[PDB]
From a paper:
The mature secreted form of Cbp1 is 78 amino acids in length, has no known domains, and, prior to this work, had only one known homolog in the closely related fungus Paracoccidioides.
Crystals of Hc H88 and Pb03 Cbp1 homologs formed after a week and diffracted to 1.6 Å. The diffraction data from Hc H88 was resolved by molecular replacement using the Pb03 model. Using this model in the Phaser program in the Phenix crystallography programming suite, we obtained a TFZ score of 8.4 and an LLG score of 63.271, supporting the validity of the molecular replacement solution. The asymmetric unit for the Pb03 Cbp1 crystal contained a single dimer, whereas the asymmetric unit for the H88 crystal contained a dimer of dimers. An alignment of the two dimers of H88 Cbp1 structure gave a root mean squared deviation (RMSD) value of 0.755 Å, indicating the structure remains largely unchanged amongst the dimers. The bottom of the C-terminal helices that form the core four-helix bundle of the Pb03 Cbp1 are much more negative relative to the Hc H88 Cbp1 homolog. Notably, when we modeled these residues on the Pb03 or H88 crystal structure, we found that the residues that were required for Cbp1 protein secretion were all facing inwards away from the protein surface, suggesting they are important for proper folding.
Author numbering:
A (entry chain B): 2 to 78
B (entry chain A): 3 to 78
The structure:
């Protein structure tokens, strides 16, 4: 089988790349998260950390039907 | 789109991992409990019975090690 360890490494690398690029951008995570139309555990956790947890921000954003909100400019698109 | 492309690759890594986990005999709830990690991602992932793959991965990334038998097929 394809290595699940490698796939986990690639997940961690994708989070790192996003974290490096997102830190350099004009992202307001609490505003972005609140703008999302997302009812999910990931969003409860992400909003609960005031957007400070980038992995939870990403998991939350993936559960929303809308990602291209004005408040999420600089964060997700 | 700098962050937009990076978010797309994040989603691809999660989607690939999701399909790969089903084929690898992974017991996510057992794996999560074996990590003994009480980070926010882990509490949320455990409450979701391991069904939320993005939170499973975020939880695993907060653990000190993935070296448990319950995480064979999930993380190694």
């Amino acid at each position: 089988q394809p290595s699940v360890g490698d796939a986990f490494d690639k997940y961690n690398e994708a989070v790192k790349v996003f974290t490096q690029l997102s830190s350099a951008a004009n992202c307001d995570w609490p505003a972005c998260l609140s703008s999302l139309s997302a009812s999910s555990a990931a969003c409860i956790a992400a909003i609960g950390e005031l957007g400070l947890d980038i992995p939870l921000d990403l998991a939350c954003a993936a559960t929303a039907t809308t990602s291209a909100t004005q408040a999420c400019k600089g964060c997700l698109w």
